[PDB]
Design a protein around this ligand. Sequence first.
Ligand SMILES: O=c1[nH]c2cc(C(F)(F)F)c(N3CCOCC3)cc2n(CP(=O)(O)O)c1=O
Lengths: 177, 180, 86, 49
Amino acid sequence: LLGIAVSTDYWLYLEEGIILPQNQSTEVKMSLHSGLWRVCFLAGEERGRCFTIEYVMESTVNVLKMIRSATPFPLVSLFFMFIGFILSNIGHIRPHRTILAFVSGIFFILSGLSLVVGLVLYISSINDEMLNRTKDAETYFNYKYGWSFAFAAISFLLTESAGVMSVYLFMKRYTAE
Amino acid sequence: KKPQKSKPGVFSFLDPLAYEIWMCIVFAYIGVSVVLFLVSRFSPYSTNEFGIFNSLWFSLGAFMQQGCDISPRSLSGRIVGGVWWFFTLIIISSYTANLAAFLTVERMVSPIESAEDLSKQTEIAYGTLDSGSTKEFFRRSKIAVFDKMWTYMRSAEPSVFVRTTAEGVARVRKSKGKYA
Amino acid sequence: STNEFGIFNSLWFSLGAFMQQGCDISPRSLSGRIVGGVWWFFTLIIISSYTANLAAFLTVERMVSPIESAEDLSKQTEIAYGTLDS
Amino acid sequence: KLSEQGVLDKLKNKWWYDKGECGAKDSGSKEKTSALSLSNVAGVFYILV
Ligand SMILES: O=c1[nH]c2cc(C(F)(F)F)c(N3CCOCC3)cc2n(CP(=O)(O)O)c1=O
């Protein structure tokens, strides 16, 4: 679930537009979706053009720099689950030497805690970038999350649950020995 | 640039109370826990429930509004437990009431208000137009404040000077309050 | 039977109930639970009245604004202003 | 000529401010903050001691 999330780029939906007064109608000027490394315009130049964050061109740029800033912490979380996944399976191959389940439980718990401070720093870095811009009566600005953000949240709950269940498999096996 | 709502700091939650109050709360926390351990020791009234490690946990529970498992059973202990309960009732009520003042009434302050403040700081850069009587005023000025401002504007990298008036206004709007 | 509520316990129970810090022991008789419960309703209103009235003081004190122009003198009439006679 | 060489500005600074008894009074007008201090809650500590 995390590997789909880090690879894909459907994280943030940003829309900017200008209203038409006395008619109760709104007309967009730009729309895009972004990820940790790849940006593709849904309605930018009314075209599906795709640039990386390094290939720049206002506030939409400044949001994109903060998404690149919050990069490392999901990569740390995937690295610790991959170590925890290997030690879990080789413990299933060899039921003796019961220490393999307990150490793998620690890598799962440290994975989820790294994912939380990833999301907290991500959401904070997005919120203040909407805050600094000057308000106008004729301009509306919106934001929305994506399905890759939903997968990372689900990836937290299953990783914490497997880290709990690995401790019980340690205790029940050590009691049987 | 006009002062606006800014990015809140990471430690902005401890803004309604001053820093001298927060250090006195810590110092009073240690002082009560030492007193509660000592007086319970030489005055017993069986098992010494209130140790130095237990007394820190008792006073921490009373400040954080939670209940504690053990209670003092002597007269001298219950006076210490009684007064420390009254202390935390006022402070937590003072923290709640001051946040209601901040969130209701918004007052914003400008960093600078005079030319002598700009000379005594290096956070905000300041510049003039390149050709005109404005730059010529700072050039031949024998006033001590204005002479200090010319030494900064001359030896500044990147150049604070602009070409036109509209370019100078555009740098003010886009530097997030770092250019005057 | 085996009751514990002496006068030293009863002053200690009422002091803990007002400060909302809990109690070691609770009344088990029905007449004891009546006198306990009404004192709980007393301390709930008094503490909530203290926090709300303190927030009333600090908000009104924050809204007090000084005079910084002649326009602010014009609309406001607790301060009197005058000039020289000739 | 005296206006453009700042000699009028030089005389004004000397007579108004340098002979001023309220020495550097403009610095005191800057500071302003709003929070609870020790003076507001001093009596609670006196009950504690
Ligand atoms: O006689 C003069 N009268 C001037 C009047 C004005 C204006 F304020 F627009 F009326 C200005 N500007 C100030 C701001 O930038 C745009 C033009 C320059 C003037 N200058 C050039 P100086 O040498 O810089 O004083 C003169 O010489």
